[PDB]
Design a protein around this ligand. Structure first.
Ligand code: CLA
Ligand code: CLA
Ligand code: CLA
Ligand code: CLA
Ligand code: CLA
Ligand code: CLA
Ligand code: CLA
Ligand SMILES: CC1=C(C#C/C(C)=C/C=C/C(C)=C/C=C/C=C(C)/C=C/C=C(C)/C=C/[C@@]23O[C@]2(C)C[C@@H](O)CC3(C)C)C(C)(C)C[C@H](O)C1
Ligand SMILES: CC1=C(C#C/C(C)=C/C=C/C(C)=C/C=C/C=C(C)/C=C/C=C(C)/C=C/[C@@]23O[C@]2(C)C[C@@H](O)CC3(C)C)C(C)(C)C[C@H](O)C1
Ligand SMILES: CC1=C(C#C/C(C)=C/C=C/C(C)=C/C=C/C=C(C)/C=C/C=C(C)/C=C/[C@@]23O[C@]2(C)C[C@@H](O)CC3(C)C)C(C)(C)C[C@H](O)C1
Ligand SMILES: CC1=C(/C=C/C(C)=C/C=C/C(C)=C\C=C\C=C(C)\C=C\C=C(C)\C=C\C2=C(C)CCCC2(C)C)C(C)(C)CCC1
Ligand code: SF4
Ligand code: SF4
Lengths: 82, 216, 86, 119, 73, 169, 131, 79
């Protein structure tokens, strides 16, 4: 059985506070003008699967987009890159 | 309970039965230029050949032996060698210029490596090594350039200050003083002045709120 | 003189005390760790700054730290032999 | 041309032999003063007197306190007691004042021991 | 009950000054005494500069993590 | 002033080596030095035959390099680094082949390290696996792009030591 | 009762949180809390809720988004016209070398292009703020 | 001169020397008087730098101190 770790004893993981997100202090980052750059989330490949466009020309179907170089997954990868 | 030995000054004790048989060298203390000494006194069951920290070798008398050196380092190295030989009764003393004898190494009669009651931690810090405050945070204070000597309360206070000062959007900017209202020190109650200051601060906050809400 | 500080990460293995060349350190009772003892530095005036305690410290980062202070050098911390400042 | 070398005959020696020698002798004499380099050598009466003068001045009398800045220490303490009362573990005998005193106090008798020389 | 992580489980070290900061080790043991500031014991396959393999961490300096994969520290 | 001038061929500081007086003079001097050195030894000597071979090598080198561009002043063949593939002494072909080979070496190695994951295997090489990885590293471009895309190449920075602590903990 | 390391850490956490709130408050005075230091100048909060305030525009905070947009567009047009006319379509270098004076219109006009740029960022800021 | 430079020897570059020194004894004396004033001021400045600020002055020194109105305005403006 696990003894419930108190809040003060609970570790604060570094992964829970990425650079693109405000730290534990919770202060919002500097406002961005080109767009309101909200907290990004990885959903590029799922959105690509959902999107229309692929139809038998490359032997593919909706939910199976044509992306041999996987340029759609680079957005998800930038979470691991920087 | 510990008794400090007489340990006469080396200049007075020219020849003693206690001194072990040693060769002699130029590595001994300079008698002309130094006066502070360190005496190491031990008791040996047998005559074991040992190396003097100052040059050559020596033979310790069966019984009481006494040696003189210049530095606690030399005395402690000889004591470590004796401990290797299983002589645990050795004691070290510092002899001042005037003959005062200060019992030094087994400070309380128990070797430092062995835990002893009545010992309290000195120069101990209640946090990890990286728990020390930032050197730049305590500047022009008591610990101007020694962040490793700040008290735990000061460390905690400085940490809380650095956490507090991240929230830029809501930080009370200190009001600019009105230099016109300056009077001589000679020209009330402390609590009353604190209360008046608090009324002034609330007035300043209200004025700030009105000014910012004018255009927003 | 140098500044020898001890932090609670100490586990009381006594290696620093045993490595001390001028007997600056001593183990003292404590409840912070399982060994029920923590090294102390009462005789910091004799510390020469050799950092042999630091060499012998096992912990991931040292539970004993020697901060060198060249401005406050004393004869004991300099190991002066031929000259005497006392 | 070159008739101004009479100036050089007096200045070059007086500037590169006499003045440097006087400066070196004066520096050696100054090295043995009570306050040789009081702003970089610890434990000097002049440095201690300067620090005491700064403390005497009203503005800087307590500017060396790391905790300086609390306008209302009593109110700060009262809030801290309220917080500790709310967050207190069951059957806790630790009080805020006692804890603050314990944390403020420490055992570092070898910090700036050279202050004795000055005083 | 077990206050810390299970014995043998992999924990990611969150002590910034640790040689194994943000990397994972195996929980050798956890001291159940409430008076131990650094009860958890974690061993790592990578020896630090002092050639030390294990260390002691507090309950807030270690979090549970999966075992390292191929090519992961 | 024209798109045609973009090519390194149409430059005023370079000329074809076969038409370069400095290039011709340099080679003529090299040939003269080699012949003078040869004349010292006897006609039927092995060293004489070797010098004949060296003279032939110099003449073939001159013929081969005549096509390359070289500066007017010094007349030494130049290496084109603009990116023009269809040009003599282009850097792109050696660049491409070296990049392929270097990526092959790196991939092989990284693959051995991932497969072994052990200091003992690092010290005592598992020669079968090492050879297997060396052979497998030929598809490194496609394999590396696929791993980069799918996230099997780089790990998040939170999984590795960032460095020393720059602040209070 | 024994004060365990967990209890000490709990006390440290509560002290940190409460006293950090206190330091943020007006009851604590530090050199870093002066005007020109960390805190915003009184009555001119530049960033609120992670969004630029009208005060970032200084004296233009009272201009509406519509008129800011019109001014930015007009300045961009006039400045681009002046720059192109001065540089390519009506060069003045030959005239000046001959000895004539520049076309004063082009020099004053050309300054409006960067002014137009900053006026657009101000128009966006004002519009984004609901003005 | 006995030139040692290749270019000097080749081009015949010369170091022309005037017949009379540029400055006279009186001019050098005036410059030395100015230099002496500089030296006295510099010794005073070195003493001031060595001794630093003296916050005790408010205890014994004459006057009650003064802040210029512009300095007061700067203080009110802030940083
Ligand atoms: C610049 C133009 C452009 C862009 C932005 C996209 C974007 C997209 N295409 Mg693509 N597509 C293009 C041109 C482009 N396409 C052309 C010309 C064709 C005809 C051959 C196609 C045919 C095509 C098909 C059949 C499908 C897509 C799909 C997609 C989506 C997933 C692949 C991807 O990440 O592409 C991103 C593309 C780029 C970043 C362009 C990079 C170009 C490189 C750098 C140069 C190569 C040039 C080349 C030799 C000529 C994505 C929305 C799939 C889809 O609908 O998924 C839902 C899908 O099934 N595309
Ligand atoms: C061979 C040299 C080399 C190597 C081994 C690396 C390695 C690295 N770089 Mg990169 N980098 C390089 C050269 C190199 N860089 C160069 C020349 C530049 C240009 C200045 C950069 C600019 C750069 C930036 C700005 C960043 C990195 C980052 C990284 C890290 C993540 C890489 C990654 O996710 O790859 C994935 C690779 C890709 C998505 C691109 C594929 C390869 C390109 C398209 C090749 C094009 C040229 C080739 C001839 C074809 C990693 C340590 C990141 C980092 O430090 O993260 C914390 C980061 O932010 N690099
Ligand atoms: C910083 C500028 C400077 C320098 C580098 C020199 C250098 C020289 N001067 Mg001097 N000189 C200077 C300014 C300077 N001069 C000025 C302003 C005057 C006008 C009063 C003269 C007048 C003068 C004469 C008449 C003669 C020289 C000569 C010389 C030579 C030997 C030194 C001497 O006799 O000084 C004597 C000069 C002075 C004592 C006047 C004060 C010089 C300067 C201002 C001192 C600056 C000190 C420096 C900032 C800090 C020193 C720190 C120290 C503790 C290490 C040497 C080439 C001799 C020469 O030509 O020999 C061939 C010579 O006969 N100088
Ligand atoms: C910053 C420096 C720079 C860069 C990045 C490039 C990049 C390039 N140059 Mg080069 N180029 C440069 C300077 C540079 N150039 C200069 C200074 C000149 C003037 C002499 C040229 C003149 C030049 C020519 C005339 C040509 C290139 C070509 C190329 C391409 C080479 C790779 C290729 O074939 O891709 C595409 C894949 C195939 C690429 C677009 C060649 C190109 O595009 O070939 C197709 C090409 O024909 N460049
Ligand atoms: C597995 C092999 C391997 C791999 C994949 C990499 C990869 C990298 N190294 Mg290199 N590196 C290696 C071995 C390897 N290194 C070794 C053995 C050393 C010690 C000399 C270094 C020392 C080194 C330094 C000092 C630096 C890099 C850097 C880099 C990066 C850019 C490329 C570069 O600078 O190349 C240049 C490579 C070298 C200077 C040394 C290469 C040595 C040989 C040729 C490779 C070893 C191959 C290995 C024996 C294969 C065996 C496999 C077989 C058993 C199956 C990149 C992440 C740079 C970086 O950080 O970029 C971001 C950088 O600064 N490396
Ligand atoms: C002058 C230096 C040099 C050269 C010319 C090469 C050349 C080569 N190396 Mg490399 N290599 C070098 C230095 C060099 N290496 C060094 C210093 C090391 C570190 C010890 C390696 C480690 C290394 C490894 C581990 C491997 C290679 C391989 C190769 C071959 C890959 C390309 C190929 O076979 O394409 C053929 C198709 C076209 C190629 C013959 C690979 C190989 O032999 O693959 C079979 C391979 O796996 N090299
Ligand atoms: C008060 C200062 C001042 C004055 C008296 C002048 C005077 C002159 N400038 Mg101008 N100039 C100034 C500031 C000034 N400039 C500044 C701040 C800049 C910006 C860098 C220039 C840039 C500039 C350029 C680039 C040129 C001149 C030229 C001229 C001449 C005619 C300009 C004309 O007809 O302007 C119209 C009235 C306004 C004249 C000598 C021209 C010249 O002398 O050509 C031979 C010329 O080519 N000026
Ligand atoms: C100015 C002017 C003119 C004009 C004009 C204008 C504005 C013209 C604009 C033209 C425009 C906008 C032309 C875009 C082309 C895009 C292409 C070819 C993209 C191909 C992209 C491809 C083939 C990508 C493929 C892949 O990425 C996929 C899909 C998935 C990946 O997994 C794999 C790869 C990487 C292989 C005229 C009309 C000329 C007349 C007169 O002169 C005046
Ligand atoms: C109101 C509203 C909307 C809107 C809108 C609309 C209709 C906006 C319209 C904007 C419009 C109509 C903007 C024109 C700009 C023209 C410029 C800058 C011209 C420069 C011209 C230049 C610099 C030309 C220079 C010269 O060429 C000249 C003149 C003669 C030549 O001899 C010489 C040169 C080359 C030097 C939406 C979008 C419907 C929804 C939104 O929610 C609310
Ligand atoms: C004291 C007293 C009183 C008095 C008095 C009286 C009458 C006093 C009179 C004093 C008098 C008559 C004092 C002249 C000085 C002349 C000087 C210093 C000239 C220097 C000139 C110099 C230094 C010039 C130098 C050079 O520039 C020269 C010229 C040439 C240049 O190449 C450069 C040099 C540097 C070389 C009262 C009022 C009666 C009563 C009171 O109760 C007490
Ligand atoms: C064309 C040309 C040119 C130019 C060039 C350039 C400009 C380039 C660029 C480049 C760049 C700008 C690049 C970038 C990059 C980035 C990144 C980011 C990368 C990364 C990488 C990685 C990650 C890798 C990995 C790997 C592999 C793949 C293999 C081996 C192993 C390893 C692992 C290393 C010149 C004139 C020179 C010459 C001529 C031609
Ligand atoms: S200082 Fe290091 S060696 Fe000494 S008791 Fe503590 S952990 Fe052990
Ligand atoms: S530095 Fe050397 S003398 Fe000083 S405490 Fe450490 S081991 Fe002892």
């Amino acid at each position: 059985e696990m003894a419930t770790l108190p809040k003060h004893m609970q570790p604060v993981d570094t992964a829970d506070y990425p650079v693109y997100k405000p730290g534990p202090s919770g202060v919002p980052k500097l406002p961005q003008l080109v767009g309101d750059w909200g907290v990004p989330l990885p959903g590029s490949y799922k959105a690509c699967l959902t999107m229309v466009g692929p139809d038998v020309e490359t032997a593919c179907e909706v939910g199976k987009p044509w992306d041999p170089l996987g340029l759609s997954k680079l957005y998800d990868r930038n979470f691991d890159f920087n | 309970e510990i008794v400090v030995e007489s340990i006469p000054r080396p200049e007075d004790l020219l020849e003693s039965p206690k001194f072990p048989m040693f060769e002699g060298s130029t590595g001994g203390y300079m008698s002309r230029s130094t006066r502070e000494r360190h005496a190491i006194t031990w008791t040996a069951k047998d005559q074991n050949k040992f190396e003097m920290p100052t040059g050559g070798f020596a033979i310790m008398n069966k019984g009481e032996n006494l040696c003189y050196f210049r530095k606690k380092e030399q005395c402690i190295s000889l004591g470590k060698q004796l401990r290797k030989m299983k002589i645990e009764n050795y004691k070290i003393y510092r002899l001042k210029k005037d003959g005062t004898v200060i019992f030094m190494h087994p400070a309380d009669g128990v070797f430092p490596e062995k835990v002893n009651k009545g010992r309290v931690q000195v120069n101990g810090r209640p946090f990890t090594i990286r728990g020390n405050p930032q050197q730049s945070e305590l500047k022009w204070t008591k610990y101007h350039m020694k962040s490793y000597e700040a008290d735990p309360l000061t460390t905690l206070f400085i940490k809380a200050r650095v956490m507090a000062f991240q929230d830029i959007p809501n930080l009370f900017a200190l009001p600019q003083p009105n230099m016109e209202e300056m009077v001589p020190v000679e020209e009330y109650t402390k609590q009353e002045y604190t209360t008046r200051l608090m009324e002034a601060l609330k007035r300043v906050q209200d004025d700030r709120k009105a000014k910012e809400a004018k255009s927003l | 003189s140098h500044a020898v500080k001890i932090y609670d990460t100490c586990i009381g293995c006594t290696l620093c005390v045993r490595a001390c060349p001028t007997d600056v350190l001593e183990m003292v009772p404590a409840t912070v760790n399982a060994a029920k003892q923590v090294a102390s530095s009462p005789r910091v005036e004799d510390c020469v700054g050799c950092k042999r305690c630091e060499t012998a410290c096992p912990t991931d980062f040292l539970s004993i730290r020697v901060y060198l202070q060249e401005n406050e050098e004393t004869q004991y911390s300099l190991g002066l032999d031929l000259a005497d400042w006392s | 041309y070159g008739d101004n070398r009479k100036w050089s005959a007096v200045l070059v020696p007086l500037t590169t032999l006499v003045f440097p020698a006087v400066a070196m002798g004066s520096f050696v004499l100054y090295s043995f003063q009570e306050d040789a380099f009081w702003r970089l050598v610890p434990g000097t009466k002049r440095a201690a007197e300067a620090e005491k003068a700064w403390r005497e001045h009203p503005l800087f009398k307590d500017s060396k306190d790391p905790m300086f800045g609390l306008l209302n220490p009593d109110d700060y303490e009262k809030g801290l007691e309220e917080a500790w009362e709310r967050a207190k573990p069951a059957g806790s005998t630790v009080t805020v004042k006692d804890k603050l005193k314990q944390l403020s106090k420490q055992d570092s008798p070898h910090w700036e021991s050279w202050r004795s020389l000055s005083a | 009950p077990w206050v810390g992580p299970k014995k043998g489980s992999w924990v990611k070290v969150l002590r910034p000054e640790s040689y194994w900061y943000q990397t994972r080790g195996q929980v050798v043991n956890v001291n159940q005494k409430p008076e131990i500031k650094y009860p958890v014991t974690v061993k790592f396959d990578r020896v630090n500069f002092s050639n030390v393999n294990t260390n002691g961490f507090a309950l807030w300096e270690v979090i549970e993590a999966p075992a390292p994969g191929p090519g992961e520290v | 002033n024209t798109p045609e001038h973009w090519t390194i061929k149409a430059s005023k500081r370079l000329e074809l080596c076969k038409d370069n007086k400095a290039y011709k003079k340099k080679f003529k001097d090299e040939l003269y030095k080699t012949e003078k050195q040869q004349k010292k030894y006897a006609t039927g000597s092995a060293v004489y035959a070797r010098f004949n071979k060296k003279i032939a090598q110099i003449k073939n080198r001159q013929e081969a390099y005549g096509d390359r561009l070289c500066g007017k002043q010094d007349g030494n063949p130049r290496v084109v680094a603009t990116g023009e593939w269809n040009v003599r002494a282009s850097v792109m072909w050696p660049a491409s082949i070296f990049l392929y080979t270097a990526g092959w070496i790196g991939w092989a190695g990284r693959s051995y390290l991932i497969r072994t994951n052990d200091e003992t295997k690092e010290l005592n090489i598992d020669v079968p696996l090492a050879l297997t990885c060396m052979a497998s590293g030929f598809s490194w471009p496609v394999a590396a792009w696929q791993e980069i895309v799918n996230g099997e190449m780089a790990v998040p920075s939170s999984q590795i030591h960032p460095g020393g602590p720059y602040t209070q903990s | 009762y024994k004060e365990t390391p967990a209890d000490e850490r709990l006390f440290e956490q509560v002290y940190l949180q409460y006293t950090s709130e206190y330091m943020k408050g007006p009851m604590y005075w530090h050199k870093d809390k002066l005007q020109g230091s960390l805190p915003d100048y009184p009555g001119r909060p530049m960033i609120r809720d992670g969004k630029y305030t009208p005060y970032v525009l200084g004296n233009l905070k009272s201009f509406s988004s519509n008129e800011l947009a019109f001014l930015s567009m007009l300045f961009f047009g006039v400045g681009l016209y002046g720059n192109l006319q001065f540089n390519y379509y009506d060069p003045q270098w030959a005239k000046v070398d001959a000895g004539g004076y520049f076309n004063v219109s082009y020099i004053v006009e050309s300054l409006l292009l960067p002014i137009s740029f900053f006026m657009h960022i101000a128009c966006y800021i004002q519009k984004q703020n609901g003005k | 001169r006995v030139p040692g430079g290749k270019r000097t020897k080749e081009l015949g570059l010369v170091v022309p020397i005037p017949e009379e020194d540029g400055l006279t004894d009186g001019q050098i004396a005036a410059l030395f008087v100015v230099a002496l004033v500089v030296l006295i001021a510099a010794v005073d400045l070195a003493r001031s730098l060595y001794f630093g600020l003296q916050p005790n002055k408010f205890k014994t020194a004459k006057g009650k101190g003064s802040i210029t109105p512009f300095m007061k305005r700067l203080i009110e403006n802030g940083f």
